[PDB]
Amino acid sequence: DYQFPLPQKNSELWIIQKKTLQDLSSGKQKLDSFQSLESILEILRDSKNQNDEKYFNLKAVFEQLDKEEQTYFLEQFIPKICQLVLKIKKKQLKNQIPKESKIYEAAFSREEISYYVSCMFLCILKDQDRKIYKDFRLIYLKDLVQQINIRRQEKIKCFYEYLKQALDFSEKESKEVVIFQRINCGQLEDYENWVDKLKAIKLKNVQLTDDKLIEDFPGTLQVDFANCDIGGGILGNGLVQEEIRFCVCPEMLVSLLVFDQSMEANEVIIMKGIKQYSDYQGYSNSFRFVKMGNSKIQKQKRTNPQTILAIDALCFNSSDNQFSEVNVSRELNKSYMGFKQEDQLKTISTGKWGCGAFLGVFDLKFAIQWIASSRSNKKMIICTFQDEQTTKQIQQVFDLYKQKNASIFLKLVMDYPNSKYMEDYTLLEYLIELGKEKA
């Protein structure tokens, strides 16, 4: 049972750190410049050396602030977050791999979570014996590629926005519980086993949306298209679906602190009580932090906690056969083991799961999720992210196969690769051709 070392674990260094924290917390030490901050950090990281690039991205965010907020940042914000670190009572966090069919759950107060994100902000979360860190140091660090520095800078804005809001927490809000769950789901079923089990199952409802994002659907089981290492490149260069979600909902960062080990094929992660703190536009290189507004919808995102299912798709290469009975049954397991969780959340909010850098064919990832949600006895919302052609296709397929038998459906899908249509039909087109052929 692995335990992630909090700063106090190293009492030697903790002496120095603590000294410096209350030093700033009190107003004893006052920061006049960003240069001052940098030496603060170098101390807290216990680092001999020091060049300017180490904090190039942090600096860049700092300098985009107005003179008033730069003042605020150095005189008020940093000291206040040092105080949050000082409120920490734990010296390590537990990373347990649940036994078969059991759950490792870890719960925190909303404020406690802010204490830990503060540690990440001040680059003091590391396991020296493993030479593993879990804070913002790479993000702060200058990269050779400007786009990458922008992504880092943008992530920094999100975490800062979040931190500012964590300081203004009402007594009530700071006590609310956030919950992380590593869930072992037991025996993996194989292809034949699946085909059998689905004979009893009918395809359930699916809704398409061109222009909405997953988090626009509060009160659903919201999917994070996760890496097997939860968080993916959140602490580095990553800025696609999973990392973006961590960016706008930074409480998720703590999952990094308890779920060190890769998810196993029969594992899923659930995060409850997660609120959204930033808005954004774009994706990857175009991703930009956008301060959250005042509208009805914005107030809700900020104040209404959501529940999130993190499941990791297979990472394919270009030669892999995604339609193999082994690969399919694997994705059926993962999604269904995930979707069947939180049975009071009867709608799954999902989308192009594993179809980006993971090279998944979306037509098939759709079919698998539909089968999984159906078996789960849940409705599904699919976000196609402005893919007009796919939207049209999936709609048609839904109209042809809703309420139809899921086992017949699966077999239909599994024959595509062999079928005649394999050459100049996509999977969805092939399904349409066979759905229209019935007349």
Ligand X SMILES: O=C(O)CCN1C(=O)/C(=C2/C(=O)N(Cc3c(Cl)cccc3Cl)c3ccc(Cl)cc32)SC1=S
> Interface residues with ligand X (CB under 6 A)?
213, 225, 240-242, 244, 282-283, 352, 354-356, 358, 385-386
**In the complex, minimum distance from the CB of residue 359 to ligand X, in angstroms, rounded to a whole number:** 10
CA distances from 360 to 43, 353, 404 (A): 45, 8, 25
CA distances from 286 to 154, 240, 241, 282 (A): 10, 10, 13, 5
Residue written as tokens 């999130």?
A: 308
Which CB atom, from 385 or from 421, has the smaller least distance to ligand X?
385
Which CB atom, from 111 or from 312, has the smaller least distance to ligand X?
312
DSSP string of 238-289, one letter each residue: --SHHHHHHHHSGGGGGHHHH--SPPPTTEEEEEEEE----EEE-SGGG-EE
**In the complex, minimum distance from the CB of residue 59 to ligand X, in angstroms, rounded to a whole number:** 28
Which CB atom, from 366 or from 409, has the smaller least distance to ligand X?
366
Structure tokens at 380: 């599904």
Residue written as tokens 């979040």?
A: 162
Which CB atom, from 138 or from 290, has the smaller least distance to ligand X?
290
Q: How far apart are CA 221 and CA 235, in angstroms?
A: 25
**In the complex, minimum distance from the CB of residue 362 to ligand X, in angstroms, rounded to a whole number:** 7
Which CB atom, from 185 or from 248, has the smaller least distance to ligand X?
248
Q: By C-alpha distance, which of 125, 121, 100 is closest to 8? A: 125
Task: List Cβ neighbours of 215 (8 Å cut-off, separation of 6 or more).
Answer: 222, 245, 248, 276, 301, 306, 349
Distance of CA 238 to the CA centre of its chain: 11
Which CB atom, from 244 or from 364, has the smaller least distance to ligand X?
244
Which CB atom, from 104 or from 289, has the smaller least distance to ligand X?
289
**In the complex, minimum distance from the CB of residue 222 to ligand X, in angstroms, rounded to a whole number:** 11
User: H-helix or E-strand containing 115?
Assistant: helix 110-121
Which CB atom, from 19 or from 291, has the smaller least distance to ligand X?
291
- Residue 266: CA count within 13 A, CB half-sphere: 14
**In the complex, minimum distance from the CB of residue 230 to ligand X, in angstroms, rounded to a whole number:** 13
**In the complex, minimum distance from the CB of residue 384 to ligand X, in angstroms, rounded to a whole number:** 8
Q: How far apart are CA 287 and CA 147, in angstroms?
A: 10
74 secondary structure, DSSP code: I
312 secondary structure, DSSP code: E
Structure tokens at 158: 């999100």
Q: By C-alpha distance, which of 250, 244, 234, 252 is closest to 282? A: 244
Contact call for residues 315 and 171 (beta carbons, < 8 A): no
**In the complex, minimum distance from the CB of residue 356 to ligand X, in angstroms, rounded to a whole number:** 3
**In the complex, minimum distance from the CB of residue 173 to ligand X, in angstroms, rounded to a whole number:** 26
**In the complex, minimum distance from the CB of residue 212 to ligand X, in angstroms, rounded to a whole number:** 8
Which CB atom, from 184 or from 373, has the smaller least distance to ligand X?
373
Which CB atom, from 160 or from 225, has the smaller least distance to ligand X?
225
Which CB atom, from 167 or from 314, has the smaller least distance to ligand X?
314
**In the complex, minimum distance from the CB of residue 364 to ligand X, in angstroms, rounded to a whole number:** 13
3-state secondary structure 13-67: HHHHHHHHHHHHHHCCCCCCCHHHHHHHHHHHCCCCCCCHHHHHHHHHHHHHCCH
- Determine the straight-line distance between the first and last CA of the chain, rounded to whole angstroms: 60
Which CB atom, from 198 or from 249, has the smaller least distance to ligand X?
249
Q: By C-alpha distance, which of 252, 247, 233 is closest to 292? A: 247
**In the complex, minimum distance from the CB of residue 246 to ligand X, in angstroms, rounded to a whole number:** 11
The one-letter code for the residue type at 427 is L
**In the complex, minimum distance from the CB of residue 304 to ligand X, in angstroms, rounded to a whole number:** 19
Residue written as tokens 């719960």?
A: 107
Q: How far apart are CA 378 and CA 383, in angstroms?
A: 16
Q: How far apart are CA 197 and CA 195, in angstroms?
A: 6
